[PDB]
Structure formats: structure tokens, C-alpha cells
Amino acid sequence: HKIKGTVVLMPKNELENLNAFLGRSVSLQLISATKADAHGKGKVGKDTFLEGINTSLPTLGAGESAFNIHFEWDGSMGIPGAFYIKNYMQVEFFLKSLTLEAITIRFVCNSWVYNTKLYKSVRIFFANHTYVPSETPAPLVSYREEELKSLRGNGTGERKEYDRIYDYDVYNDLGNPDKSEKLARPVLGGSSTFPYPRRGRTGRGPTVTDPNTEKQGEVFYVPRDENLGHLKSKDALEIGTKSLSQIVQPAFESAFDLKSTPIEFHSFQDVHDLYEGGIKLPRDVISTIIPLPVIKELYRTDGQHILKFPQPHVVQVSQSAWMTDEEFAREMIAGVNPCVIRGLEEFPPKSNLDPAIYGDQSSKITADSLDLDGYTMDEALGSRRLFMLDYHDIFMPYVRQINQLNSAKTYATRTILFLREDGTLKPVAIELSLPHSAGDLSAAVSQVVLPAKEGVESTIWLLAKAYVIVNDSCYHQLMSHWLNTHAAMEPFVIATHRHLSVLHPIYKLLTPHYRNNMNINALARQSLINANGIIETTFLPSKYSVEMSSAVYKNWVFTDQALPADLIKRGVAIKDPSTPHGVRLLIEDYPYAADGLEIWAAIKTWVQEYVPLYYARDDDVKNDSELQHWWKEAVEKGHGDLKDKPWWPKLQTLEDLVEVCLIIIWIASALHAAVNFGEYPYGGLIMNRPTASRRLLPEKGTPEYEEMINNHEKAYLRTITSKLPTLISLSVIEILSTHASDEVYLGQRDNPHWTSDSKALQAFQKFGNKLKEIEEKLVRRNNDPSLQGNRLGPVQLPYTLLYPSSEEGLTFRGIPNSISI
Ligand SMILES: [Fe+3]
């Protein structure tokens, strides 16, 4: 009756001896998928313990250990399709897999197994077979549904480290009212005032001063297997933000309070010095930073007084190129935030904001003042050569409250761009707008600034570009990055674990694209977007930052996240059935869009080849109970504040299923990579990507105006992010722009046996081959001299953000499967 099996596991001291696992320390019980008891449930075998350590196969790394085990299983017990496991040891271990031979049967587990007394029900694992609900072997049907009920929990209770309960809650855990009324923040989600995607429920309970806000916690829970261990401490990048906010930031502050370093940058060279000779800090400040995991990888040091940041890619060839109008415009199509620019089809541009509240909103930009390389405005409009980076309606509602803050002053900006005959974009005007209402104490007014290369006019134009980029950096960080990827994706991760069994084909299709997302999001709610957290203390909006993202979410549209839909909606492409991708770009050499369409196409082919393997007709999608409950919950609960919108796909057809999966995979992989991995490469020079502005343009006749004339670099530095928040911000984006060495990229999976279905495996193989094919093509584009203007620019920085592959580090390339940092 014996079945020879091999158990691979990792002792806790590996992701954060052997003989202790033997004896009666760990028992497994096989469950039959073909032979059932009197209740239709698969028969269960006897408790079998680990017999010995297997030291036979070389292919076994990652601090993993193999154990031999034999089960009493007669042919009459049917075929095993699952197993129970109980850990009698005090300390948890990481279960990798179980492999049964003559009968091969593989089980991919990758799950922490805590002491048996901590679990309400015994941990169960299934073989690597894939089944839509109606295809589940009858003896496993109930076990499948029971595991899902276990994962859903009951919606109450404080979640614990070892819990594996997935549920939703609103963002009511960012404020810290018990510490100070000044740290109170509006609850985001669950109201018409503040709609917002839901996040993972933690259940710590209410604060003492506000029943609607969740109390503080030293650890923000995520279902256990969402918290990724790492073999190398340097790869635990997500812990970096907590260390930065709680340990490093206070250390930097003391250096400034003690006046051990100049409080402000006084010249552009003071900024360049950070990645050259470095910055000198107090000994104890260096000593506080140098020993921390992850943090110590951010700077080179002499071990005593110096911290040196790495040279950002944007200055590696020319340290002054960022100041060119050419690079300013190019970064709108190949920079850190390449997805906001829109076509402009009328002139002057219009506003939908209420003039009764903000004053006359007519644009003050006159067509006759613009240099369109000889084109008349009507010619530029008609030839589709006019574009804009429009933050006017987005920022105007918040300008008054932001400008009331100390050290924060902004404009609601609009930039007009012209597509030159040579295919590059050039900036032709910037409008710096302020709201005007009766009784305004401020005398500052709106103004239009035009390009200028000499005189005070050139300084004013450089400052106008800085106000625009402060708007762009804020929108990029809070919306393009945080809202559209991190926050938007979490509800789908939760729904997937709550309603699609690990056996489900769609679960297998989508879960690789969720790796580390709930984990980084929980760490973000704790240290990145919390009251007085990193973002609030480094970006322009301060305490209004996260709520601004809620106002933007009001207009978030799931189907508009598809790349073709996005391009068409923004007026940078038109539908064209005669083209390979179904769309014709209006900026032919738009790096992000051109490379993105290649990746989008590859993902679509993959999804279109996968789905058919499990759903033959539209009725098969309509009748999948798990799939229907999954989608219904993702929409009505996860993104519930928008359940009233008409645009949600129905999921009653193969077409809709493909669409939904394609968009989810796109957001998690390529979209997030394109907006994330260029953060330090472009933003590592604070002048190129300022996060905040502290004053408006000066009045003629004041010393500030005189300063623009006599010391333009100081005028610029006094206007943008101060030195202290710059040091913190550079540190944060350096972490976010780094690829951990254990990352899993698009076209890869953590285990070659994720499914036993050879056809699904074949399809995945073709997808990976296609991505390698695409990379060769993108390499050719970057090497094409005719595309240099937009793909490299004056900074001579080849656009590699959508190259699928990458080695570890701050590489400016590589597409991870998920939002993993
Ligand atoms: Fe990210």
C-alpha cells in the first residue's frame, strides 16, 4: 500500500535543525479525489510523519530541505488529489511542496504552516490540477468550498499574523486622532464625498477619540502568505519605507535642527554634490543609517560622516539637459509619468470649473503669441499637432487650501505642446492659474509664461516649468502610481482569494500578478500615505494629498485602463482597424505608447489562448458560480463606491472575461512598471522632478524679483522642495526604483509546475518567447538614430522601461508580474 513522497520545506530561519522535523513533529494525511465517504467527501488517510532527510537531488536550493515520507494508500483509496498537514512544532515553517511518485502527482504549496493549535481547521493543500467549478472531482467539491469559506472569515475580529482571512475595509486607518487632532484625516471610501477603492481588513478596532477611525498598530496585518519572506535581507525592499520614516527621517532632522548642515541648497552644484562627493552628516547620524537592512544599500559611505547617493540616469551623460525645453516635453511621453498628455482640438483650451467659485476661467493664452514653427493655430489644430498637459481643472479646486499652508504655494497649470515636423514635442506656453474670489487677501494673479532663453524672462520660464512639474509629480505619485496601480488593484486581489479556489484556472492566471501587492500596500498605509507620513511630509499637498486621490477616483473608469482605450480617450491616438494594434498614434514616436502596445498585444494573445482552454462558450462563463461571485464582489464591494457606474463589464461572455483579465494583468505589470521604475532615474535630480513648490512668482520691485535676475539658481531652489524633504524623498524613490533579486518578471512563474495542464504550460511558454521577441524589437528602436529625439533625448537616456527583462537593482528596465514595490 505504499506511496513514496518527498516534502520540501524551509525552516523559519531561512526566509527571515532538520532532525527536529522528524519523529512526530509533522504529519500529513492524503485525501482522495476519486474515492469518497458516506457524505461524498474524499476519504482521508492515516497521519503520516516525516521519516528522514533526503540528501539526493542537487536541484534544491533556496535554503530548502527535502524530507522522505511514505503513505499507506491502497488502490482502493482512489487517487490522491489533496492533503492535510499538521505542524506539532512550536515554530512555523514554510511548506514548499509535496511530490508523490508511482500513482507523478505534484503539490505546489508555498505556504507558512503554523503550530496546529493556532488553526481553527487543519491546513489543506490541493494537487496542481486545474478545474472550473463544474469540473471539480465530486470528492473534492465540499473541501473546495470549505477552503473558500475559511478564507473569507466572518468579517469580525482582530486579524493575527498567522490568519489567512481576506476581507475589505475603507481607508480609515491613515489618521492618528488619538495622538493629535491635527493628525485626524477623513475616511476615504464609503461615502459620496470620498469614494475610494477598499483595502484589506485588519480589524484593530476604533481609536479612543473617533469610532470611525481604526487605532494604530505596530504591525498592519496582511493574510500570512501575502507577507513575502526573502532569502536575502537586502531584497525586503518593502520594509524600507518604515525604517525611513521612523528611523532615518528623525536622524536627518536632528542634523538640521543642530545646524550641522546648511538648511537649504544654495546652488545647483549643492544638489549635484549629493551623488558626487556626497553630503557630510554628524557621526551619530551616519551610525544610525549604516546598519539598517535595505537602507544601507541606498548610499555609499566612508562609515563616518559621508552619505553618497547614486548618480541618477538622467544626468549620466549631460547634467544640464534636464533644463532644456526638449527634455521637459519629451518626459511627457517617455518620462516617469508618460500617460497624462492629451490632444488639444480647440483653442483656447476650456475649463469645466464653476466661474462663480473660481472667477472667470477663460484661458489667457493667445494664439498669436505662440511659436508653432510657422503653422497657424488652425493648421496646428487640424493636423493634430497640438497637445496639452492639463492640470488646470484637476488642481484648481485645491489651490486655495494648499496655498493657505505654510511653505506651500502652487498654481493650477496648463502647458501647451506642439508636435514639430521632426516628430518631437516642444513646449509653447504655460498658464499658471490661481482661483479668484471676493475678499481674497492675496494679490497674486494668474499669468501666462512663454519660452525664453535669456534674461530674467528665461528664469521666469524655468520657474514656470518647475510649477508644472510640481503639479505633474503630485499627480504622478498620488494618481498615476498610487491610485491607478496600488489602490485600484487591491480589491481584485481580495476578491480573487475570497471567491476563486486555488484550483480555479482564473485564480492561476491572475494570482502571479498580485505578488507582494497587499503587503506593500499595508506598509504604505502605515508609513507612506499616513498622517505625517512620507508623502505628506515631502509633497506639495501635505495633509490634502490622499484625499485629492479620492476626488480623482470619482472619475476612474476600469475599462479606460486598457491601453488602447486610454490612448483614444486622451486624444493621442485614433481607432484604426487597418493597423496591427487597432489604433493609430498621433505622436508616431511616443515611446511609452509604442512600446506599451507591443506588451499589451502579447498579454492579450496569452489571455486569449488561455481562456479557451477552460471555457468553450459564453454560457460556460455565465455558469461559473465562483467567477460570477468573484466579479460581483470585486465590483459591488471592492470598488463598491462606483458600483452605480454604467461602464462595468458584465462577465457573461468569453469576450468580457478576456477583457477583464487583460486589463487586470496590464495594470499590475506593464502599467505599474512604466510609472514606477523611472522614479529615481528621472527624479533623482530634484530640479528635474520637484515634489513641492513653496512660493509663487515674485512681484517686480521686490528683492525676490531681484534675486531671479542676480541668482537664478537660488531663486529656483528657494521655490522647489527644501533640502531636508529632498533627502527623504530621494531615499524613498531610490527604494521604489530598485528590483529585488528574487523578483518574478512578466513571462515567468515562481514554479514550473503551477498547473498539470500541458496546453496551458505550452501557451505560457509561447508568451515568454513572444516577450523575448518584443525586447529585441525595442532594442532595435532604441538603436534607431531616427528615433533618438524622443527615445533618448538630450539626456541620452534610452527608453528601456518597457523592456520585459532585467537583472536586480536600479536598472530603469524590467516588467515585474505585479505591483511588488
Ligand atoms: Fe509602486
Swiss-Prot record:
Its EC number is 1.13.11.12. Fe cation binds at H481, H486, H672, N676, I821. GO terms for cellular component: cytoplasm. Changing A524S: Little effect on reaction profile. Pathway: Lipid metabolism; oxylipin biosynthesis. InterPro entries: LipOase, LipOase_C, LipOase_C_sf, LipOase_CS, LipOase_Fe_BS, LipOase_plant, Lipoxy_PLAT/LH2, Lipoxygenase_dom_3. Plant lipoxygenase may be involved in a number of diverse aspects of plant physiology including growth and development, pest resistance, and senescence or responses to wounding. At pH above 8.5, only (9Z,11E,13S)-13-hydroperoxyoctadeca-9,11-dienoate is produced, but as the pH decreases, the proportion of (9S)-hydroperoxide increases linearly until at pH 6.0 it represents about 25 % of the products. Belongs to the lipoxygenase family. This is Seed linoleate 13S-lipoxygenase-1. The gene is LOX1.1.
